[model samples]
Target: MDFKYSRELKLESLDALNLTEGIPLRVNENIDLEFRGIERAHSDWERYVGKLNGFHGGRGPQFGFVSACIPECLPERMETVSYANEFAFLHDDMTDAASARSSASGKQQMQAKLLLEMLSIDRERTMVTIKAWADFMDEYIPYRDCGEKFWFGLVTFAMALSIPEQELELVQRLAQNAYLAAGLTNDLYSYEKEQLVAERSVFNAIAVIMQEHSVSISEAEDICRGRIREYAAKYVRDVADLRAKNELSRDSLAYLETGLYGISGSTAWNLDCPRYQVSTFVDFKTP
Candidate 1:
């Protein structure tokens, strides 16, 4: 199951993609450089990761960075989103751990229910993740149906207004492209780590492509990279067209541009985040 996980391969792929360098990023100007809530979220994540890694001996993902990189996030809602991101990270980790051990579906369901229940009960719960879920849920109810998914809804909430009815379809198309690019990029970079940790098949693009096309790991990765680039360019082109129409309001424009920021910003985070590897393969700046 060994594949090329070298610095050269990563650099070559990134150099060709030129993701963060090629795209423009718009950051939230209202973000606080220092905040207690975010600080607490980081502390909680670190504590949980440290305890979990005691057995797995794996590097922890930087869950805080995802919220930080979300360009359209309002200052007031950043803390809630930060904790939400941490909750997701912890939930995924626990789910994978339980799956690896062949734990029963009912047991895992109960664990998930307990975590969800904590979101409504109190923030002072004994479990570190309970507090995070509680904080996240406090502000999440209002925007529960903002989009088709929770993460998308969070981004939609950040825009401060719903997509104009006339432009909803176009916006959804762009959002789909953005989500594919962001998701495929994650699958590509996280392949090595997933393979390292998984006891069963890792459900990533690389793995899927390798099986579907009967291709080598390198070829599968190349296919995955091409798909990522294709979608990313599509997103950029769509946004450009939308912007040139000059029909959208300033907030709408900002909301659309934030999708672009999400793509490159997350790629930048993936390039260096300890979740996938310890040493960074490339040097890139994230706005």
Candidate 2:
């Protein structure tokens, strides 16, 4: 169980994380044996995942490294986001009963348990890491209301109290708007691959537009992307205004940067990563 944190996340985003002169976000990996051989000593999830880590892609290091790019975000916090990212994929997959991920119900079936096992190995740290984990995960999954998912990042980022003085209500709303932009952006990029399974999966924002507006798939995609850009622009303006008015602190600005970078970086990362690669009937192989 020798653990090391390599910069498995190779992208342009890292080039610009410096707070002093952090460059603007760019719409931003390859597969090597990054997550391999991390022994699953504590949990039997290995039995569940027919194949293990990095057989597909980097697990903890990827997400942790991305979030850690922000200057004030600590190492431990970056590590925690890794666990959170794994858990999130697990929840989505587990709930959806998804497959074709790497080995099993890639996102749906065993990923949740396997990820939980991976993070749990560090109870001392896991406890520290899982702080506000459930706000998005399903200790309240039973109570998970649609659209509330956006708050997960908002609440998590709020732990730093970076935003200028504002009521929890106002902050949460702004956070949700930002999160929605990210979430919809996800639905936009993932629409192609995700829609392949559209019969069972209904999360595509593209499809919603198609179904609702009777527009073509490509058109719907444009609509989604347009919205993502629009939201990003709006958020950027809001953050700037807040800064100019002496509302948002430097740390608060950085806090917002994580989400801002993520909104665009997500598309960049997803495009580059194998995890989000779409499958077709010809090439789609399921284990």
Candidate 3:
């Protein structure tokens, strides 16, 4: 079946995301950030995701693109982080599709619990990705301890790498704005494509707002855009407040700076990537 749809939508572009109005975009200047991990990740992509039944391989997002845009990620660690990104994309796509298809099974109803069925489906195809995750943990563990929150994607390696356990009490308040802004940016940009493939419940902010508040699509989008700007403003203000008081350590400064750039970097990547475009959301169920 051809999954054809309009490419044009009145969604916010990177410029309209307006993160730059508050924080500077500090992407990595190193040439190797985006290019370093392509071959290795692609080989694994073929073995793992390619082995899966329903994924459209060629239409997958630029899996390694966002890692290049994070300014604080060490050049040596870029490939590992790239692998982490690839794993995240694969995991989300796999589970989302699986849960929707197998909604009758209690195991698949909760996305958190779906890993049981996911790994059970094909160990040879899945265990290799688990090994790759272990490598990521080995690299990440020295900087910070891994936990359920970290493993479940609620917190990112960027957050862990920047803030230690002791200082988290103070930094979390500021980081919330960055996380929210990044999330809402995703919701705003990906809303159109998600509308087409929203097989189960709708989780995107635009859809949620329209349903919960009984608002028009335009009204929901406007509310989402307003929140994006609000969080960006709050993040900038909080960072400046800490800097002015000299309360921020060198690591603290880097942590906040990473969030600031992360907002813009994520926005730029989402606006351009194929992951959220309608044309790329084709059915490639392996038969």
Candidate 4:
């Protein structure tokens, strides 16, 4: 396989559909047994989309287009709840398989399984919509591994939360746009952390591709930061409201702090790398 990078590489809509629809129907059916609630949520999303349609040049179709596209964008390993369960078992040693099989995390996986399953149940409408959405992501933006899949899944859930009976379509579109913007923002902001230090991350792939294309590291950094700022400005509402309830949440801040540690620790391995100049988690935001 030619791994050489090319900015010219374009993703196709049909490709997204092919990837998402390829998931087994039995898996979808079994999963949907638990996510019937998502179907209920879709009704609201339809209404939200309807209200937002007139604002753009009939951008309503893009919503469904993007939603459909998500399944294909999802990591292949996450196609089923059981797969996620197995992944958790293998990766997050904190959770025991036997107990996890019946815990909230397990149920969440089951929910995801059902959502995908329900999506596939209606091959013509829902399934098609999802595949198209996934294709949009694949074509317009590049994503890597768990972050890409997790964001897509989270955005879908957010859409489900925002959709109302009459504006389901509009909500879907809004959600899709928000998701795409977020993907772009995240890709840019964490490029160095993801690429050089984190390894195996989407940002790393992006960095590798950019380097292959003769894009300077500085240029890539600028592009990424600029993209993130643009999205943050355009869609402030959709931004993760980490500050909504408090100055910091232990759970949320813990990841941010731990990430800083990882970044700094990795720098110790290669002092020559410029990314080492990054501030420690303790000093990350300090002036």
Assess each prediction's global lDDT (C-alpha) against the native: 0.54, 0.44, 0.53, 0.31
Off by over 4 Å in 3: 1-20, 31-33, 52-64, 100-162, 199-201, 285-287
User: Residue 202 error for model 4, in Å?
Assistant: 5.5
Ranking by TM-score: 3, 1, 2, 4
For each candidate in turn, the TM-score is 0.64, 0.60, 0.67, 0.30
lDDT by residue for model 4 (1-287), tens: 01111111122431332211111111111223112333333332233221112111101111211112222212222233222222222222222212223444544554455457646533333343344335322222543223333433332332222223354443334344334444443344346553443343242434744655567777665555455445434333432343253344342332222222222222121222222223321212101
Scored against the true structure, residue 33 in model 3 reaches a CA lDDT of: 47
**Model 1 bad stretches (over 4 Å):** 1-16, 25-39, 42-51, 54-64, 99-148, 199-201, 278-287
lDDT of candidate 1 over 178-246, digit per residue (tens): 777778887888888677655333767788888777889889888878878888888888888878987
* lDDT (Cα, 0-100) at 110 in candidate 3: 30
Among the numbered candidates, top lDDT falls to 1
* Clash count of each predicted structure: 0, 5, 0, 39
Candidate 2 ranges with C-alpha deviation above 4 Å: 1-23, 26-44, 47-65, 68-72, 98-132, 135-166, 198-201, 248-252, 279-287
Model 2 C-alpha lDDT versus the unseen true structure? 0.44
Cα-based lDDT at residue 190, candidate 3: 85
Clashing pairs in 3: none
Taking the tens digit of each residue's C-alpha lDDT, what string does model 3 give over 50-75? Answer: 45443322122432344424555555
